[PDB]
Amino acid sequence: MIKQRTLKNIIRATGVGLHSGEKVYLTLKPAPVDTGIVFSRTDLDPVVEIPARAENVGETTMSTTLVKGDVKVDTVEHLLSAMAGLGIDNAYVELSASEVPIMDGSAGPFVFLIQSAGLQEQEAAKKFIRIKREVSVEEGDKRAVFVPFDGFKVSFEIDFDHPVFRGRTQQASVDFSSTSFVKEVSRARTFGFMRDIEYLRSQNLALGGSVENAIVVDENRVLNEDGLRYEDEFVKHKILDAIGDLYLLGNSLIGEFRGFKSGHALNNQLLRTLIADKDAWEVVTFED
Ligand SMILES: N[C@H](CC(=O)O)C(=O)Nc1cccc(OC(F)(F)F)c1
Ligand SMILES: [Zn+2]
């Protein structure tokens, strides 16, 4: 049988909060079969646990935030995406503050950490969620769809009205049977804009954003293009966010995702919509 995975080892990393702008302490730990990815706030007494589930998703304004009463964790999408990309079913994620360290603003640091800690196979079948029929959500001009597909494919399109895109719709599509998540999706950074950042810093927000975690754009052009790692990088980060959002299902996905100018709100809306639709999906394990 294809088996569940966790971490061979504990691993500790340090970085800065995307809004606080100050050091935050992160530990990845092995976890038992059928745990899922569980976040815990070790800076509080008692320690508070937030399972990474569709139901526990909060505000979704700029990042995917999980919530439990007054306890929250901001910016979970990049690390969940790394978890989803390397097939990590079970892990504990300890945090000394309210957010995941931003690191370089992509999944690459998390992918690296998970790999260094080692992948540990567990004596239980990997549970996959197969899309049986089409599910879609819409909010104005924004749309997100699930489609039956035998494999894992993700597509994203966005007409972003900024000169750096030369009037062109931005589109990217990744079938993960024939393309590598780590090599071609995991290192993607988003586009920061001096107008958005300029305001946010001056409104006491995103004190962590810089050229270290985003591609800074000035309402005309990318400011130093030395930052780029990919062609069509901005849609690719949309694909990266989408895989982190989709993993709040708690299981790997057999099927197809299509994003039309979507993000955190609509991705979670699509997830809750699918879960509600019992004839839309099923759970399956495989032989190897
Ligand atoms: N997942 C979101 C992307 C989204 O919701 O489109 C994201 O990565 N945001 C993000 C990442 C790094 C820095 C940042 O602040 C900045 F503003 F300073 F750049 C924002
Ligand atoms: Zn992101």
Q: Say if residue 158 is in the same domain as residue 111.
A: no
Q: What are phi and psi of 176, to 5 degrees?
A: -90, 10
Q: Say if residue 101 is in the same domain as residue 240.
A: no
Tokens linked to 172 = 């990217």
Please provide the DSSP assignment of 193-225 as one string. EHHHHHHHHHTT--TT-STTTSEEE-SSSBS-G
Sign of CA dihedral 256, 262, 268, 269: negative
* Other C-beta atoms lying within 10 Å of the C-beta of residue 6: 22
Question: Who contacts 258 (Cβ-Cβ below 8 Å, separation ≥6)?
Answer: 143, 144, 145, 147, 155, 156
Q: Say if residue 119 is in the same domain as residue 170.
A: no
Q: Say if residue 139 is in the same domain as residue 263.
A: yes
Tokens linked to 46 = 């008692």
Give the H or E element holding residue 37.
strand 37-41
Rounded CA-CA distance 167/153 in Å is: 27
Q: For ligand 1, which residues put their CB under 6 angstroms from it?
A: 18, 62-63, 77, 102, 105, 190, 192, 196-197, 206, 209, 213-214, 241, 263-264
Rounded CA-CA distance 284/126 in Å is: 8
Burial of residue 170, with CB atoms counted within 10 A of its CB: 0-12 exposed, 13-18 middle, 19 or more buried? middle
Rounded CA-CA distance 86/126 in Å is: 13
Rounded CA-CA distance 31/157 in Å is: 36
Rounded CA-CA distance 265/282 in Å is: 24
Q: What is the CA radius of gyration of the chain?
A: 18
Nearest residue (CA) to ligand 1, atom 12: 105
Q: Say if residue 112 is in the same domain as residue 226.
A: no
Expressed in angstroms and rounded, the spacing between residue 38 Cα and the centre of ligand 1 is: 23
Expressed in angstroms and rounded, the spacing between residue 177 Cα and the centre of ligand 2 is: 23
Expressed in angstroms and rounded, the spacing between residue 215 Cα and the centre of ligand 1 is: 10
Q: Say if residue 22 is in the same domain as residue 107.
A: yes
Sign of CA dihedral 76, 77, 83, 84: positive
List, as residue ranges, the binding site: 78, 237, 241
Question: Of 109, 127, 145, which residue constitutes the final position of a domain?
Answer: 127
Sign of CA dihedral 275, 239, 237, 34: positive
Q: Say if residue 146 is in the same domain as residue 60.
A: no
Give the β-pairing of 252-260 and 128-131. Answer: parallel
Strands of the chain (E only): list them. Answer: 3-7, 11-16, 23-30, 37-41, 48-51, 66-68, 71-73, 91-95, 119-125, 128-131, 135-139, 142-147, 152-158, 170-175, 191-193, 215-217, 252-260, 281-284
Length of the chain: 288
Q: Say if residue 167 is in the same domain as residue 88.
A: no
What is the number of structural domains in the chain? Answer: 2
Q: Say if residue 58 is in the same domain as residue 118.
A: yes
Residue 19 annotated to the active site: no
Residue 28's SS3 state is strand
Expressed in angstroms and rounded, the spacing between residue 102 Cα and the centre of ligand 2 is: 9
Q: Say if residue 150 is in the same domain as residue 104.
A: no
Question: Of 92, 111, 127, which residue constitutes the final position of a domain?
Answer: 127
For the CA of 75, the closest atom of ligand 1 is 1
Residue in 111, 264, 269, 270 annotated catalytic:
264
Rounded CA-CA distance 156/170 in Å is: 8
Question: Of 81, 98, 127, which residue constitutes the final position of a domain?
Answer: 127
Rounded CA-CA distance 222/214 in Å is: 11
Rounded CA-CA distance 219/195 in Å is: 7
Resolution (A): 2.5
Residue 55's SS3 state is helix
Amino acid at 233: E
Domain that holds residue 230: 128-288
Rounded CA-CA distance 128/116 in Å is: 25
Q: Say if residue 115 is in the same domain as residue 54.
A: yes
Please provide the DSSP assignment of 231-245 as one string. TTHHHHHHHHHHHHH
Task: Write down the residue that tokens 């992509």 correspond to.
Answer: 106
Q: Do residues 252 and 84 touch, judged by C-beta distance below 8 A? A: yes
Mutate to test the pocket of ligand 1, among 190, 216, 245 (most ligand atoms within 8 A of CB): 190
